[PDB]
Amino acid sequence: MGLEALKSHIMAAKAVANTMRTSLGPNGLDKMMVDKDGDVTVTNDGATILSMMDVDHQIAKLMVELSKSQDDEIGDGTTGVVVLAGALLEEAEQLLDRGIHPIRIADGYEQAARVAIERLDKISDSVLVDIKDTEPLIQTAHRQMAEIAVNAVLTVADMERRDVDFELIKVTKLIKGVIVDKDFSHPQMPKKVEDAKIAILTCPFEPPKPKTKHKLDVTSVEDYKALQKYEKEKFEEMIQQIKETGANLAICQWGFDDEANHLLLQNNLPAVRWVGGPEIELIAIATGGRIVPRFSELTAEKLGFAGLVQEISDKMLVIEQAVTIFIHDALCVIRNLIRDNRVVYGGGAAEISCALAVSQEADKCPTLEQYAMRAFADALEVIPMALSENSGMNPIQTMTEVRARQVKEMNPALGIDCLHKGTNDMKQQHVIETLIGKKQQISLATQMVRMILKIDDIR
Amino acid sequence: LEALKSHIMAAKAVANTMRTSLGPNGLDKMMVDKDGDVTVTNDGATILSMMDVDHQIAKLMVELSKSQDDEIGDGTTGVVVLAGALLEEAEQLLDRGIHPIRIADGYEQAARVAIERLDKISDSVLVDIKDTEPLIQTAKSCHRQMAEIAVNAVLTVADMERRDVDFELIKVEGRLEDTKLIKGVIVDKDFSHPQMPKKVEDAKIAILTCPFEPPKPKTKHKLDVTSVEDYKALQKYEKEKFEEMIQQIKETGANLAICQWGFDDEANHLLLQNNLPAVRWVGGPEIELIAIATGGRIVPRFSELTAEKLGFAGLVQEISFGTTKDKMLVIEQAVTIFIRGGNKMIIEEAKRSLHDALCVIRNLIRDNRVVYGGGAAEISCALAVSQEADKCPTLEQYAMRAFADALEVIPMALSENSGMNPIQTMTEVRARQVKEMNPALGIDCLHKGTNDMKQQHVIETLIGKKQQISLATQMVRMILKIDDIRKP
Amino acid sequence: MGLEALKSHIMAAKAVANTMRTSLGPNGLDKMMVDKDGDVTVTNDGATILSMMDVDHQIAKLMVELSKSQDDEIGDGTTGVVVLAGALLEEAEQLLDRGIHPIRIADGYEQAARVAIERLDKISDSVLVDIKDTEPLIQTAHRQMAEIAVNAVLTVADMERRDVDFELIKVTKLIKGVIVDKDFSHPQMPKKVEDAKIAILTCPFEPPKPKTKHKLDVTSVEDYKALQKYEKEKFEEMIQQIKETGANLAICQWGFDDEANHLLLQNNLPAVRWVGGPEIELIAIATGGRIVPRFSELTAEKLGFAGLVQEISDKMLVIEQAVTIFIHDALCVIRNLIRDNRVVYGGGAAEISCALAVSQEADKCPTLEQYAMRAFADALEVIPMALSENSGMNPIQTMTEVRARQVKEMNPALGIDCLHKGTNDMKQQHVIETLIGKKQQISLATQMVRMILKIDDIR
Amino acid sequence: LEALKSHIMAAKAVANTMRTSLGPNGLDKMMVDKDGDVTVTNDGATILSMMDVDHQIAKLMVELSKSQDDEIGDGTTGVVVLAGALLEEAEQLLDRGIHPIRIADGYEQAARVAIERLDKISDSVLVDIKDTEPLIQTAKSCHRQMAEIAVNAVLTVADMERRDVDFELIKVEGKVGGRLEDTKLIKGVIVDKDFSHPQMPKKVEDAKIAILTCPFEPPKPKTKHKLDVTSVEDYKALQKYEKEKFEEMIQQIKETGANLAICQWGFDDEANHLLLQNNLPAVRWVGGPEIELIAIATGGRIVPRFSELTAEKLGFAGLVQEISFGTTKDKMLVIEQCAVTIFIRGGNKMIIEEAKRSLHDALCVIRNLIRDNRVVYGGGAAEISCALAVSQEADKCPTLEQYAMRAFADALEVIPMALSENSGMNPIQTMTEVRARQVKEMNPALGIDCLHKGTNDMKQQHVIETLIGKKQQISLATQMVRMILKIDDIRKP
Numbered sequence A, C: 001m002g003l004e005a006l007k008s009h010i011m012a013a014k015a016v017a018n019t020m021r022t023s024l025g026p027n028g029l030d031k032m033m034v035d036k037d038g039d040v041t042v043t044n045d046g047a048t049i050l051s052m053m054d055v056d057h058q059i060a061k062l063m064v065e066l067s068k069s070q071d072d073e074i075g076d077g078t079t080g081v082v083v084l085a086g087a088l089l090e091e092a093e094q095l096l097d098r099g100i101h102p103i104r105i106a107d108g109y110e111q112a113a114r115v116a117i118e119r120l121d122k123i124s125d126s127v128l129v130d131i132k133d134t135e136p137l138i139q140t141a142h143r144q145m146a147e148i149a150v151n152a153v154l155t156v157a158d159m160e161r162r163d164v165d166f167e168l169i170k171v172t173k174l175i176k177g178v179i180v181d182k183d184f185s186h187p188q189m190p191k192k193v194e195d196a197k198i199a200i201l202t203c204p205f206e207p208p209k210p211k212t213k214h215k216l217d218v219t220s221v222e223d224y225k226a227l228q229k230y231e232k233e234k235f236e237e238m239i240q241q242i243k244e245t246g247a248n249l250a251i252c253q254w255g256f257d258d259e260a261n262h263l264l265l266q267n268n269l270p271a272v273r274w275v276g277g278p279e280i281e282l283i284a285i286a287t288g289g290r291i292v293p294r295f296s297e298l299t300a301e302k303l304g305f306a307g308l309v310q311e312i313s314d315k316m317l318v319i320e321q322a323v324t325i326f327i328h329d330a331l332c333v334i335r336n337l338i339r340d341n342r343v344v345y346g347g348g349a350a351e352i353s354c355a356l357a358v359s360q361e362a363d364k365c366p367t368l369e370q371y372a373m374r375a376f377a378d379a380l381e382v383i384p385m386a387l388s389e390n391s392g393m394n395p396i397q398t399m400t401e402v403r404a405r406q407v408k409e410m411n412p413a414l415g416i417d418c419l420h421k422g423t424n425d426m427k428q429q430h431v432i433e434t435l436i437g438k439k440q441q442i443s444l445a446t447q448m449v450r451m452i453l454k455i456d457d458i459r
Numbered sequence B: 001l002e003a004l005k006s007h008i009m010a011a012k013a014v015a016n017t018m019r020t021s022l023g024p025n026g027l028d029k030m031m032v033d034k035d036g037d038v039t040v041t042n043d044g045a046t047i048l049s050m051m052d053v054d055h056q057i058a059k060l061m062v063e064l065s066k067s068q069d070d071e072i073g074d075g076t077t078g079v080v081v082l083a084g085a086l087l088e089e090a091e092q093l094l095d096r097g098i099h100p101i102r103i104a105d106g107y108e109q110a111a112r113v114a115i116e117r118l119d120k121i122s123d124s125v126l127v128d129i130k131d132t133e134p135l136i137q138t139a140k141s142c143h144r145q146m147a148e149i150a151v152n153a154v155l156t157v158a159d160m161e162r163r164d165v166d167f168e169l170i171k172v173e174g175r176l177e178d179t180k181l182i183k184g185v186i187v188d189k190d191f192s193h194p195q196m197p198k199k200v201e202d203a204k205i206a207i208l209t210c211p212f213e214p215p216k217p218k219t220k221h222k223l224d225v226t227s228v229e230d231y232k233a234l235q236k237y238e239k240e241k242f243e244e245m246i247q248q249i250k251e252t253g254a255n256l257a258i259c260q261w262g263f264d265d266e267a268n269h270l271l272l273q274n275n276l277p278a279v280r281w282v283g284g285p286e287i288e289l290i291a292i293a294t295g296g297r298i299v300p301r302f303s304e305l306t307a308e309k310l311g312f313a314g315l316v317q318e319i320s321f322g323t324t325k326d327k328m329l330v331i332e333q334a335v336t337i338f339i340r341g342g343n344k345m346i347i348e349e350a351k352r353s354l355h356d357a358l359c360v361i362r363n364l365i366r367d368n369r370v371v372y373g374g375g376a377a378e379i380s381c382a383l384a385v386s387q388e389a390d391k392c393p394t395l396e397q398y399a400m401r402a403f404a405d406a407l408e409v410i411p412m413a414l415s416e417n418s419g420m421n422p423i424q425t426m427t428e429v430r431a432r433q434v435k436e437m438n439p440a441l442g443i444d445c446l447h448k449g450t451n452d453m454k455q456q457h458v459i460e461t462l463i464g465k466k467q468q469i470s471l472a473t474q475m476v477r478m479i480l481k482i483d484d485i486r487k488p
Numbered sequence D: 001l002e003a004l005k006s007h008i009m010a011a012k013a014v015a016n017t018m019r020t021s022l023g024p025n026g027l028d029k030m031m032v033d034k035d036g037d038v039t040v041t042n043d044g045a046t047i048l049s050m051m052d053v054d055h056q057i058a059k060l061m062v063e064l065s066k067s068q069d070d071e072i073g074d075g076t077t078g079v080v081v082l083a084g085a086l087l088e089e090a091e092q093l094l095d096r097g098i099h100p101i102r103i104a105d106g107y108e109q110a111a112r113v114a115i116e117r118l119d120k121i122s123d124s125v126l127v128d129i130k131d132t133e134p135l136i137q138t139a140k141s142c143h144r145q146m147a148e149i150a151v152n153a154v155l156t157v158a159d160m161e162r163r164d165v166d167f168e169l170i171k172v173e174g175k176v177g178g179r180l181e182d183t184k185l186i187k188g189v190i191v192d193k194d195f196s197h198p199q200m201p202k203k204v205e206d207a208k209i210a211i212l213t214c215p216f217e218p219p220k221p222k223t224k225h226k227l228d229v230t231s232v233e234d235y236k237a238l239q240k241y242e243k244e245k246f247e248e249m250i251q252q253i254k255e256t257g258a259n260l261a262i263c264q265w266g267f268d269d270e271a272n273h274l275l276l277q278n279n280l281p282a283v284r285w286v287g288g289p290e291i292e293l294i295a296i297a298t299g300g301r302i303v304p305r306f307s308e309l310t311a312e313k314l315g316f317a318g319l320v321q322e323i324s325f326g327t328t329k330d331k332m333l334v335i336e337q338c339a340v341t342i343f344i345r346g347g348n349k350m351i352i353e354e355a356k357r358s359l360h361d362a363l364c365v366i367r368n369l370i371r372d373n374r375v376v377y378g379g380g381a382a383e384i385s386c387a388l389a390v391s392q393e394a395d396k397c398p399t400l401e402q403y404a405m406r407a408f409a410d411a412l413e414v415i416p417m418a419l420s421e422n423s424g425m426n427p428i429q430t431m432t433e434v435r436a437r438q439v440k441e442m443n444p445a446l447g448i449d450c451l452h453k454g455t456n457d458m459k460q461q462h463v464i465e466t467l468i469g470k471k472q473q474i475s476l477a478t479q480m481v482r483m484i485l486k487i488d489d490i491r492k493p
C-alpha cells in the first residue's frame, strides 16, 4: 500500500524490538531457539539471535545485517541497536500522526544523532596503552583472559598507527600462531615439514575423462589390472606436478582414499584431506597461498611460505607468511580501544546524558525538527527503562530519579545499578562501553530508522 | 468508450505509484527480483525496468519510458508523472464530450508551444575548456574528481567536428580517491594458466562463441573400448583434434584468442606448447565488448573463419590487484571508466551518479544549453501554453489549458515530496514568475535555500526537457487512441 | 437452429463490423492486439487486424479471408468491406422482420450492387500513363516514394496489354533485382558466381541408412576414423553429383555444419544454408529453378539461370531468369491504375453518389426488391457516417448536408472533410480510391451478405 | 485496566468527531431527529444536545458539557476537543507505566497553572456606554445591529446596581419569513397562539390580564355517576344549567377588571362562544413557560382558581395585539408593567436558527462580562500562552507529575492546531511558527488568523473570549478527564 505500509513497517520492526527488549542487560532472557532437526541454544546477546529467527517481513529481515554486519563485526553491543531503532520508530509514529513528513523526521534524527555523538566526546574518559591497564580493564568481560587477550591482540596490531586488524584470531594455553585439526593422513610421513611450500588445491584427483561415446569394455587381468595401473600412473603425473612447482606438503579437498595416499608417501608429498572453505582459506590467508581450481594446472608463485608444520596428538603450523587462541567478547573491545582509547560509562548513563544534550539543544530549534529531536531524546531514554524493567525495578521511577541526579550532581555516569547490588554510581563496577561502540550504535540505529522512513510501497 | 477510461485509470495508477519518488526526496522502492538480490533506488529509471508487467497500458508505460529518455537523457520519473497527469485531465475533457483525437491534436499543439518556450528560457554554456567541470558538481569532497573523469571520458570519445554524438564506449567495473583514469576498455579473469605470455602487444583477437570438441559423426554409434591403448589412443585422438584446431586458428593471425564454453582438461596446456594464449570463458558481455572495441566481428564456427575478422588491438596486459588478478587491454581499433572504492556500496552509488554525468555531458555536447530545474521551467512552460490557449478558439482551447495544468503537477509533486503545501507554494511561485519576470525560481526544494534556483545551480539541460515533453505527449497520444486490446 | 441462426449470424457478423467501425478513416483507433508470448502491434487498416483476432463464430471467421484474400491481395481498402457487410446485414434484419424472404434480399442486393458499380463508371475520372502524373498521384500514400514505386512497377509490368503482375516485389536505395540475406557460409569461397546454375535442394545430407537391425559396434581408431572418413566420402558423392548436373552455387535447407562445408570449398561448390519456404521459393520463382526433394537424385533441367550472384556486408543476385525494393500501400494502387486508369474520389463521396443512384433507381421498382435496394442505399451511407463520427463530427448532420449538396451542386466529389481542415470539396486534398478498389469492395461485401443470407442450420 | 483504554478511545472518538466543527470554519453535521425535521449547526452545544447518545462515557461528556458550560458559559466544542486531547496524551502516559491517579494529579496542577496564567494575559473592557457593542462582533455580515440589540437586551434587564447577576425573563421567537436585516427593536414580551374566535377584538388596549391555570368547565362530583336525562324538558334543563354556570365565571372575572383573560388547559366547546357574547377575549392554551413570562411581566399573580380571585392580581398592560405572519398568526403585546423579548424574521427557514444561536452567544458573552469584565484574545492565543507557561512549570518539576504537565501542555495546543486545519492551513507548521512568534515578540495575543484575512496579530480583529469562559473551559475539561481517568469496570447492569 501507499502510506499505511509505513505504519506497517513501524509495527513490523518494533515487533522485533519488543521481541529482544527482554534480553537486554545482564538479566536478559535466554530464548530457546532450536533449528529444524538441531538442538537448543539458550543465550542472551541478540547478536546470535538475529542470525537465527525467521525472515518474516522484509523490514524485519532489514533489522538483521544492519544490527549484525556492523556491530557484530565492528563493535560488540547488538541488542541496543535494534531496541533503539524500534523506539525511534515508535516516536516517529506519533510524529507522523501529528502531520510531520517522514523525510523531515529522518533529517531531524540525523541532526539529533550528531548532537549525541559529539557529546560522547565530552562524556569520554581516556585510558592509557602499551602495558597493564588494559588487562585490569578486561575483567569486565577469570584473571588470565585479560592477559592472553591483551598480548594476543598486541602481537597482531598496526599500532603505528591507524590501529586496525581482524581476522587473524579464532579458537587453556598460550599460542604461537594459527592451528588446524586432522592429520596429514598416513603417519609414515614426516611430522617435520619445516620450510613448507603449501599447495592449496580445491579439486578432484581423477584421470581426465575424454568427451566421446565411452562405454569401456574390459576382460579380466589383461585390461583391468592395466586400468588400475593406468590411473595410478596418472596419479603420479599430478604428484610429479606438485613437486615441480614448490615442494613438501599440500592441502586438498574432496577425495583421496584408495592406494593414492600410499603413493604420495613414496614420493615424499605429505598432503592433507579433506576440508571445505574453512581451514582452506584459513591457511590461504595465513601462509601464501591463493587457491588453485586445478587439478595439476598451476604455477608457484601461489604456494605459501609457512616456516614450521608439525603434528601432535591435530597438526599445527607456526611461523607464517597471524596468531590464534586455543582453549569472544573483549577481543573486539580491545580493538576499539586500539582505535580510540576513550571510554564512556554504560548502564544507560551515556544514553541519559546524550538525551539531556539532544533535548537541551532541541529547546532552541525552529520549524519541525524540534519535535524530531525531542522524540530522539525520548528514544534514547528507552535503554535505561528497559534495563530497569528487566531487573524488576519500576521503569519510569528509577529512570526519572537518575535523569534528575545527573543534572544536579553533574555526573554523566550514575544510572541503573543494575545488578541490585551497588551504589548506582556506575563509576565503580567499572562498566564501560568504549567510544566506537556507542557512536557506531547510534549511527546504525539512525541509519535503520532513516531507511525505513524513506521506504514506501515496496511490493 | 469505457476502454479509454480504463487505460486512463490504469496508467495514472503507475504515475501515482512513482509520484512520491520524484525529486531528491524520493522513497527508494525496495523491489526484489526473481531468486536474486535487491536493488534500492529512487529515480524511476530502475523502477520501470522492474515492478509488474500487468496491463498492456502499464507495459506500454514502460519501454516507451525505458529506452528513450533513460538512453538519451537522464530524467525518467518525470516523464511518467507528466503522462499520468495528462491522462487525469484528459478524463475530465472526455467527460465534456470531446473526442480523443481532438485532445491528442490539442496536446500536440500545446507541447509545441512549450518546447518553443524552452529555447526562450535557455542559458548557454561554453565547451572545449572547463565550464563543464564546475557544472557537474550538481549531479551528485566526493564531487571534485567525478566531474573531471567524466569530462575527459566524453572528451576523448566524441565526434566534436561536429554533429556531436557518441555512446556507448563507457562503462565501470566496481576508496573513491583511488578511482583511476582510464586508457581503454578493461576486463577481468585471466588468460588461464600464468605460464602464458602477459605481453600480447599487436594482438590479433579471435572471437569464438563456438565449443571446442572433436567432430562427432552422425551415424548409429555405440562406441566401445578394449582399454590398454584403445583408451589412451582415444585420448591421443582428441588431443590431435585439439592440436588440429590450435594451429588452424594460428593460420590467419595468432596472438591471443577469446572463447566461450569448454576448455578444461590439458587442452590449454597444448595451446601453451603452440603459443596461443587464449581466454575463457564469458558470455554476451566481453564477447561483444571486445568485439565492438577491437575488430573483431564474431565467429560462430568451428573450422570456418578468415582474418579479416581479427581485431588489431595494440596492447594486452595482465595486472594483479592484491591477491586475485585481472587482465586489461589498451590501444584499440575507445575508453571505459574504472572504480574501486571498497565496501561495495561506495560503488554503485558513484556509478549511478556518474551515469548522470555522461548523459548530461552528451546532452550538452549535442546542444549546449540549460534550463533551470526544480519545476520552474515547467511553470514558465505552463504560463506559455495557457497564454496561447486564451487566444485560441474551438476545442483545442480546452486541450491546451489541460496540458498546462498537467505541466504544473511536477512543481506540485516536487512540493509535496519535500513537505511543503503542494498547490499553495506552486501558485505563489507561478505568481513570482510573472511579477519578477524570472523563468528560474521555484520549489526550494531541499527545504534550505533562497528559492531562486539560479543559485543551487540545478540544470536539466535542453534535450532532457524537450525529450521529456515529446515523449509524454507521444505516450499520451497513443493511449488516448487505441481501444479493444484483442489478446488472442 | 433453423431460422434464428440467421439473426444469430447477423449479430455475430455485425459484431465484427462494430469492432472495426472505429478504425475506419484516418482518425481510426490502433487496437493493441498482442499474440501469446509476442509483443504489441498498434495500427489502423483492418487488413492486418483480420489476420489476428480470433476464430469466434464460423461466420466471424467467414468475415476474414473474404475481406482478406481479395482486397488485401487485389485492392487495398479492407475495413470498408467489413463495415459495409455489417451494415447490409443490419438493414437485411429489418427487411427479414418485415416478412421478406432472405434469398429475395440477396438478389435485391445483387441488382443494387449492379447499379452502384455501373455508376462508378459515370463518377470515374481518367488519369494519364507512361510518364510523370502517376508520381504526383502517389503523394496521397515523402517525395521519392512515388518515383521509386513508379519505376519499380514500370520495370515489372505487362503493359501491352492485359496489365497484370505480382508478386516480384518485397523488401533507401534503388534496386536491380531480388535480394537475400545470410552468406554462402565460409568466406574463402568465391564472391563472384556470375552465370550461376542454382541447385535448389530442400533435403538432408546424410549417408543413406539401410533398413535392418542395426546397432553399430566400433573399437577406437580402426573402425571409428573409418566411419568419419566414410561419411565424408559419401558427402563427396553428393558434391560430385551436384556438379555433374549444373555447376557453381546451390541452395540448401536443414543441416550442413561439420567439416562438410569445408569439403565443398575444395570442390568449388559455394552453396548456402539454411532457410525455410521463403528465400527458397523466392529464388525458385526468380531464377529457375523448381524444387528438388532429394538428396542427390535430380536432373537439370531444374537449375536456375541467374546471371550474377555477389556478396556484400547479405549476398544478392542480379540478372534473373523480377525487381524488389530495398530500404506497402501505393504499390497495389499503381497496379490497379495499370489495369484501369480511372479513379473516383473517396472520403465516402463515391458511396453517397452510389446511394443516390441506387435509391433513384429503387423508386421505380415492383415487388419486394424495392425495399432491398433502398436498404442497400442506406447501407452504403454508413461509410460517410462512420467517417464523420471517427473524427468527432455529428454523423447524420454532416452526412445529410453533404447528400443534399451533391444533388444541388451536381458534384459526386465533396463529402466528409475529414481531417477537420479543408474545403470539403474532396477534389482538392487529392483523395482517390481508383476504380477496381471500390468495384471490388462492393462486389465482395455483397458476396459476403449473400453468402450469410443463404446459410442456415450449419451445425 | 483496558476498560480505561476503551473509555479513552470512545471519548477521543467523540472529540475527533467535533474537532472539525471548531472555530468559525467548522462543519455542520446533518443531524436529523425522530420523525421530524433536520438541524445543521456548528457550536457543539446543540450537537451534544442531540448527537448519538450511546456510550456511558460519551453520556458523561454530554452530562458535564451541559452541566456547567452550556448552562453558564458559551464555548462547548472546545471542552470536548481539549478533553479528547488530554485523554489521547494520558493514554501514552498510561503505557509509560504511570498510575492514572498521578496523571490526574499532574493534570490538576497544570490546570491550576494555566488558569492562574489567564489572569496575567487578561485585558479590561469598559461598561455602561457603547463599549461592549463593537466587541460582540466576535460571536458571529449582519453584525452591526445584532450587537446593538444584544447589549440593549442584556443591559435593560440586569441587576446592574450592582451584584451583577441576571438572566432569563428574556426569550427569542423567530417567525420565519423575511431577511435577517428585518429584525426589529423590541419592547415587551411577545407570545404565540391566539385569543381564539375570529370575531374577537384583534387589538385590546389598556388590558387588565387575568392569568389562570384552570379548566373552564363546571366541576362534577366525580363519584360513580350514571347521568341519565329523562324528559326532553330535562335535556333543556341540563343545557340551561351549564349555560348559566359557564357565565357564573365570566362576570366573576369582569367584576375584578376584565378586558382579556389568559387560560391554561381547556377552553371548552361553547365557552369561547359565551366569552365573545360577554366581550371577554381570553386565550388558550399554553403551559408553564409563556405563562410565567406574562406573570412576571405584567402583574400578574397566577390564580389556581376557578371563580376565586380579586384584582389586585390583574396586571396593567398598555397594548395587546394580534398580528398575522403569512397565514398563521401570533398575538404580541407592547407597553407592559415590566421584561423584553427579541424577534427575528430571517426567511428561508434555515436563515433563522442561525440568528438564534448567534444571538444567544451575545447574551451569554455580555452576561459573563457584567459578572467579571475581563477578556483574553481567542484564536487559540490564550491556549498557546497557557501551554508555554505549563511547559515552563513542567521543566522545573520532578517525579511523575512532570510528564503529566508536559502532556497537558501539548494537549492545550490542539485548539490552535484544530483551528489551523479547519481553515486549510498546515496544522503543525503555522502553530509552531506562532508559538515561536509569541516568545520572540512576547505578545500573548497573535495566532491563527483565522479568517485567512488579516495581520495574524489578533490584537486587531478583536477576538475576545472573556475570562470565565476560558477558566470554566479548562476547569470543566480537567474535571471530565479527571473522572474518565478514574472509573473502571463500567458495571451497567
Ligand SMILES: Nc1ncnc2c1ncn2[C@@H]1O[C@H](COP(=O)(O)OP(=O)(O)O)[C@@H](O)[C@H]1O
Pocket: A023, A024, A025, A026, A028, A044, A045, A046, A047, A076, A077, A078, A079, A080, A081, A346, A347, A348, A387, A416, A417, A418, A419, A429, A431
Ligand atoms: N554490569 C552492568 N550494569 C549495568 N548495565 C550493564 C552491565 N553490563 C552490561 N550492561 C548493559 O547491557 C546492555 C546490552 O548488553 P547485552 O544485553 O549483553 O547485549 P548487547 O551487548 O549485544 O547489547 C549494554 O548497553 C550495557 O549498558
Ligand SMILES: Nc1ncnc2c1ncn2[C@@H]1O[C@H](COP(=O)(O)OP(=O)(O)O)[C@@H](O)[C@H]1O
Pocket: B021, B022, B023, B024, B026, B042, B043, B044, B045, B074, B075, B076, B077, B078, B079, B373, B374, B375, B414, B443, B444, B445, B446, B456, B458, B460
Ligand atoms: N537540487 C534540486 N532542487 C530541486 N529539484 C531538483 C533538484 N535536483 C533534482 N530536482 C528535480 O527532480 C526531478 C526528477 O529527478 P529524479 O526524481 O532524480 O528522477 P528523474 O531524474 O529520473 O526524473 C527533476 O525534474 C528535477 O527538477
Ligand SMILES: Nc1ncnc2c1ncn2[C@@H]1O[C@H](COP(=O)(O)OP(=O)(O)O)[C@@H](O)[C@H]1O
Pocket: C023, C024, C025, C026, C028, C044, C045, C046, C047, C076, C077, C078, C079, C080, C081, C346, C347, C348, C387, C416, C417, C418, C419, C429, C431
Ligand atoms: N484524406 C482523407 N480524407 C477523407 N477520407 C479518407 C482520407 N484518406 C482515407 N480516407 C478514407 O478511409 C477509408 C478507409 O481507409 P482505412 O481506414 O485506412 O482502411 P482501409 O483502407 O483498409 O479501408 C477509405 O474509404 C477512404 O475513403
Ligand SMILES: Nc1ncnc2c1ncn2[C@@H]1O[C@H](COP(=O)(O)OP(=O)(O)O)[C@@H](O)[C@H]1O
Pocket: D021, D022, D023, D024, D026, D042, D043, D044, D045, D074, D075, D076, D077, D078, D079, D138, D378, D379, D380, D415, D419, D448, D449, D450, D451, D461, D463
Ligand atoms: N474570528 C475568529 N478568529 C479566530 N478564532 C475564532 C474566531 N471566532 C471564534 N474563534 C474560535 O472558535 C473557537 C470555538 O468557537 P465555536 O467553534 O463557535 O464553538 P464553541 O464556542 O462552542 O467552542 C474559540 O476557541 C475561538 O478561539
Ligand SMILES: [Mg+2]
Pocket: B074, B075
Ligand atoms: Mg534527476
Ligand SMILES: [Mg+2]
Pocket: D043, D074, D075, D076, D361
Ligand atoms: Mg461558539
